[PDB]
Symmetry: C3
Subunit: 336 residues, 3 copies
């Protein structure tokens, strides 16, 4: 059989300074420890583990609050380290070779999209999330960076981003028109304001309920990738899925996507042939029971396999086995 993607790269980013619950740094390990790699090879894909990006984690004294942001210099230093590594991987990829990134809290997305856009400036972004993650710093109630990662990247938002020297190299590489959200159900007011003002395509769980996921996917792809010309950066927050199916995550919100709805998003996005980067964020194996962690891990693996082209309707074998070749008598043969 033929594959859309025959090889793929894998990268861990154990960010944990974007939100205060310890454990998202164990995200990549949660996936490495799974049968993910084995299942992908069983499908005929050559998957290369490119290791982990080491985040910059400064101490309290070196990284005081600034404009309410917690760990903002850790954030900016990490953003640039991430961007550099992703850019480098995406350029040696130039059948494309998708990069699979396992986080880590969602604050990594500023860095991953930054680097990705360097290699492929024309990209679009599909943001699968219960949350907007597009708070500008003075509007954030939490001061957690994992709630702001897109705001630094969107050109139309720059008049609401306070200036900092160490953020200078974080160049806004996205237009509002290049992003589509699926799964929203917990926007902060100011996000709603920005999303509506600048016309960012979004499809909330309400849209998913009224339209159905099949149409929502079609609409999202239509909105930001009409003729499949652009590379896709698929940013998948695990908390988009329902807590019944992904409990081990920092900010669970009831009424989420079913696993199946999530698989459909990924299957469709994979099948475009334009999946350039997929990142899975906000796994925290330190949250919930042991069985919660397994449910979450399992959901992540199915989700990630779908992204690489796994087909729930089955895969043909590489060589068809035949009974005679082993010198073995078949029942049909025997009946003579």
């Amino acid at each position: 059989p033929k594959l859309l993607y025959t090889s793929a790269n894998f990268l861990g980013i154990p960010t944990n300074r974007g939100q205060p619950k310890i454990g998202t740094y164990q995200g990549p390990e949660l996936i490495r420890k799974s049968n993910f790699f084995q299942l992908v090879a069983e499908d005929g894909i050559q998957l290369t583990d490119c290791g982990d990006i080491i985040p910059v984690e400064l101490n309290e004294a070196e990284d005081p609050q600034r404009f309410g942001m917690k760990w903002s210099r850790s954030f900016s230093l990490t953003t640039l380290r991430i961007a550099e590594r992703v850019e480098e991987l995406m350029k040696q990829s130039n059948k494309s070779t998708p990069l699979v990134i396992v986080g880590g809290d969602h604050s990594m997305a500023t860095g991953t999209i930054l680097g990705h856009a360097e290699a492929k400036p024309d990209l679009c972004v599909l943001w699968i999330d219960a949350h907007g993650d597009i708070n500008t710093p003075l509007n954030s109630a939490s001061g957690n960076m994992h709630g702001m990662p897109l705001s630094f990247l969107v050109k139309e938002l720059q008049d609401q981003i306070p200036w900092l020297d160490d953020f200078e190299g974080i160049k806004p590489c996205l237009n509002a028109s290049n992003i589509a959200y699926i799964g929203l159900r917990d926007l902060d007011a100011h996000e709603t304001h920005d999303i509506r003002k600048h016309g960012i395509a979004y499809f909330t769980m309400l849209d998913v309920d009224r339209m159905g996921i099949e149409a929502v996917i079609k609409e999202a792809l239509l909105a930001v990738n009409p003729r499949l010309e652009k590379a896709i950066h698929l940013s998948f927050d695990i908390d988009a899925l329902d807590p019944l199916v992904a409990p081990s995550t920092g900010t669970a919100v009831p009424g989420g996507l079913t696993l199946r709805e999530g698989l459909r998003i990924c299957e469709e996005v994979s099948a475009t042939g334009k999946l350039s980067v997929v990142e899975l964020a906000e796994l925290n194996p330190l949250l919930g029971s042991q069985e919660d962690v397994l449910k979450t891990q399992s959901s992540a693996v199915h989700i990630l396999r779908a992204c690489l082209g796994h087909c729930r309707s089955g895969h043909l074998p590489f060589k068809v086995r035949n009974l005679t070749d082993q010198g073995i008598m078949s029942r049909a043969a025997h009946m003579q």
Copy 2:
């Protein structure tokens, strides 16, 4: 932004004599103890806690079985106390001001609808429930009052209600044509008989499966509130939701509404502008594990927020924050 309802009243009714499992009396506390009030205020709604109705709970000697009914004089005395309090609240409400009632087992509905109809005689009732709760007393296998509350209220059923002096003030204020059921999946035979005989609109989980919830809501509202002329009494039994999402309740039945389907019912009913009373019944925080109770509580809060107009697609902020007003340099400003 504008709201359909800018204020709202909140009332607890800790009924527990309608069914034998202790704990539904802790229902209202389960919700007060939650972030419900905070979330509602965050949406710009002024919510007034009107306290709890104290139920009449007689002892065994004072309240023997009568026609098989358990605690029927506690029921009738409580029905009148409830009716009086609700009538009083709904008249000082005369942008309507919705009343949110947290139970308590479902037997409270005889009282709440009675009083509600006093203030607004022309109402319709949307009954969201896995059960009919319309057993007449000699047909009830359990003798539990929470399985009979509508039978006393429906005019066409009065020839099957045995007469009791203390029930005289429970005047049948509903026509069969004023009620619509959504969510049914466990009707007793005699309920099925009555529901079909007198032509009560009903939509079972089977209808929900074949029609989809969007159409079922439209049909229900069409059946009992064609042009949105009537006040709506929305009686929401928590056990309508699936046990996976509301386990802490006395008579759980598998195959229920998803949380999302429930939210859609409430969102639609809210958006009519006719939500006059909403009541949530059969929470029992004494049932199930600690995590079961949290799941149930959480579902109740999302459900109740939807009823008051909460929007999963987001809310605009009351004042838009701007970076310059604080004397702060934006990144866009800096780039000159």
Copy 3:
């Protein structure tokens, strides 16, 4: 009211040599121990417990591996014992009288279909399962018989079945065109190859997602039972349902049918009037927590009740109770 089936037979088959996890032999007991029998009688169906089939379980020395198969002589001996008993029951059934079989691992299906086809050679098979269970022996990675049961039965597969004397009486009684799958999401490559090559109708969770269960059922029935002329053998693997709703089973796969989707399959299949045999496979009450076992048991009972005609929209009573006959004064009567 009228019933499609007024009586029914019940048979346990505690197979456990088709897969290595101990406990599927407790399947039938799990259902007998439930309120299943009571609920069915409450619907007006006369259900006769025909006891259990005793499987042949040979020791290691007597049953070595052959062509990789584990316990293949236990399998063949059991297949014939099952076939004989089912044939006998289905002939004394000649309003049909459905046979309800509770397993037991799925390897029993070779025997049950064999015997069923003896009594009703013209049957079709609806296979509800996350798995294909149609591996030929040299293609099986596990060597577990519960993954092969259909391969011995399908005429087009016989050139890939190795001959064994003790399998001679296992006569291939099915054509590829007589089988339809619903629920697939974990086919082995060689199954996919066979299913596509010989044109077996199949509807995976992907089809269920895109088409919706209502259409998938219609298509399946169209594919193998166009004008409802054929008896239906409904082979229901509990692991077709989602692990959230049937956790206690040996090979759980995420992203399954909802309980409701499963009920719809059964309701539709029941309503054809052609439900001849229904079998439920792969219950293992030795797996999972106590609450997992209850969830699974409960799902099985609802599923099996649906198969026998249970209606979620309610059942009429056998005799309508009337208030006057007991010499009792109604409220309506009193108001004169």
